[PDB]
Design a binder for this molecule. Structure first.
Ligand SMILES: CCCCCCCCCO[C@@H]1O[C@H](CO)[C@@H](O)[C@H](O)[C@H]1O
Ligand SMILES: CCCCCCCCCO[C@@H]1O[C@H](CO)[C@@H](O)[C@H](O)[C@H]1O
Ligand SMILES: CCCCCCCCCO[C@@H]1O[C@H](CO)[C@@H](O)[C@H](O)[C@H]1O
Ligand SMILES: CCCCCCCCCO[C@@H]1O[C@H](CO)[C@@H](O)[C@H](O)[C@H]1O
Lengths: 264, 334
């Protein structure tokens, strides 16, 4: 079945990454940390679901996993909250990033697309990240705007990328619309998921919900808007019907299990 | 007075390109100032682009290279967290710059995959090297030179490799890179022996081991001379970049004249200077440090010196057998 395929890609992606981190000098502690980024290693699978060839699909999924983890380490490096070596973080981050550009470029119909896609909205992504951390959100409007950069544009670039290294007949705008909508659903999920790991403060949105600054129904509505946006994206021909239940799994998880944890 | 102009121009060009970029992306006036303060970093893309016959390709490559070098410096500052700068801005401006760097370099590259190829060839060597460099402080010239070969030579070598790759025709890849690796270690020593007092900034590893006697002034001198030669040669390789010759001497001699002395002493490197002569059937050897009066008669240098107690000794040698230290005391006195 399909869950079988997702589980295998996740394990292939995980191994491609930890092997890479280990051979560049990352300690057992950082290797385990990259292996703990489950959704980050899984999402590249959903992102390459319009890729016909299984071999090309596995190569693109992992190349993308290499850069997603890389950017996620960059993030942990700017926050300094993981208690992981500052040096190993930077070093591994750059190493994984260079490996990803290399693999992705060798799979792209045209190597220049990789960097065109990366530069296209780099300012949007980076400046938004600066904006986001600079000022907390005070209501759903601001949260959502901050989230379309660290969440949506971030994932959206990888969608664009998968389309571009995913061979022929990949509806590029559609893979990206899925990427950005899905990214926001899981970004909320994480913001609302507390793990108790050290100096990890309440997730902004979760706080806004418990404070009352953000309306419960309003979150529900956004969730629904994001489910529709993604279902529409995967319905567009040629289609990726296989992502349909995935969109539902994640959107329904936040509605059923995460929201009740924050009704303030 | 004309090349120095081209350099001054590339340096401002590169600076403006980088600061304009850091600002558009959101960095605070602090970080825009900091990147601006990276003089050498912004300037060196000029020397790497010296084999580029077409001036516009050159301006373009020089600045792309500037963007990445600064980006990499920012990531280093980000791992040290000693700058006082905001980590978020550092990280974000870091990535932004690098992405812009990638795009611009690939646009001028001879082959679509050259850039990512170069950047990947020795990523593990540079990245794993950086981790070792920082986990263990060096303790002898040998260990310093090995650390420096990665965060200095390897680091700048890639930018050399990239300069040749995006620099049109007439680029001797290997030479460009060997220049970069040699020159890089030179300025890296210079940075190391240069103190600035900003924050809790460490005396440079090498300057420390030098003031501790763990490293020999003459050895440092030798190493600089090795790097000056390695460089000079790389710029001699046809088609050649005659223009980097004065540049090579400029920086090398700077470390020798100004920097080295701040860490050694009254006695530079090597051994003390001596005069060897034959006096009253004897064989004498005097330290120029003991030579009092010294004058010239024909092609003979006659002198007097301190021979123990209030005992005044004399001598005379052909100018040919006179050490440069003595031959100078002539000009001080006459
Ligand atoms: C991921 C690319 C799209 C951007 C949205 C980021 C959401 C990722 C959240 O996933 C979860 O993150 C936790 C900590 O961040 C991990 O403890 C957990 O194992 C992982 O499953
Ligand atoms: C993650 C890969 C690491 C690549 C980035 C390394 C930084 C490149 C330049 O090195 C610089 O050398 C100077 C001279 O010693 C130091 O004063 C300075 O701090 C350091 O920035
Ligand atoms: C060029 C990358 C290769 C690494 C070799 C180190 C050269 C960089 C040293 O230059 C100087 O660094 C200082 C930071 O400590 C700045 O304050 C100063 O203005 C700048 O001119
Ligand atoms: C310089 C631009 C870098 C963009 C940032 C790339 C990483 C994006 C993932 O964001 C993640 O969002 C989660 C949900 O809120 C947080 O739990 C987590 O801490 C944070 O890592």
């Amino acid at each position: 079945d399909d869950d079988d395929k997702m589980l295998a890609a996740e394990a292939a992606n995980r191994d491609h990454v930890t092997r890479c981190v280990a051979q560049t000098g990352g300690s057992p502690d950082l290797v385990a940390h990259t292996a703990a980024l489950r959704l980050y290693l899984r999402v590249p699978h959903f992102l390459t679901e319009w890729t016909t060839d299984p071999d090309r699909r596995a190569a693109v999924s992992r190349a993308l996993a290499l850069d997603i983890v890389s950017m996620k380490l960059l993030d942990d490096l700017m926050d300094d909250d993981t208690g992981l070596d500052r040096v190993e973080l930077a070093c591994v981050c750059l190493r994984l990033h260079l490996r990803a550009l290399h693999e992705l470029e060798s799979l792209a119909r045209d190597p220049k697309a990789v960097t065109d896609i990366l530069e296209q909205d780099a300012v949007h992504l980076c400046g938004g990240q600066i904006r986001t951390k600079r000022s907390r959100a005070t209501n759903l409007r601001e949260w959502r705007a901050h989230a379309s950069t660290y969440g949506s544009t971030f994932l959206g670039r990888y969608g664009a990328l998968a389309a571009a290294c995913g061979g022929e007949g990949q509806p590029a705008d559609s893979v990206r619309e899925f990427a950005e909508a899905f990214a926001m659903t899981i970004t909320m999920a994480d913001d609302l998921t507390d793990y108790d790991r050290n100096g990890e403060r309440d997730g902004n949105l979760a706080h806004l919900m418990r404070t009352g600054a953000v309306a419960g129904q309003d979150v529900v509505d956004l969730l629904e808007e994001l489910r529709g946006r993604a279902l529409a994206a995967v319905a567009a021909p040629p289609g990726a019907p296989g992502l349909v239940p995935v969109v539902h799994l994640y959107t329904d998880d936040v509605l059923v299990r995460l929201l009740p944890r924050h009704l303030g």
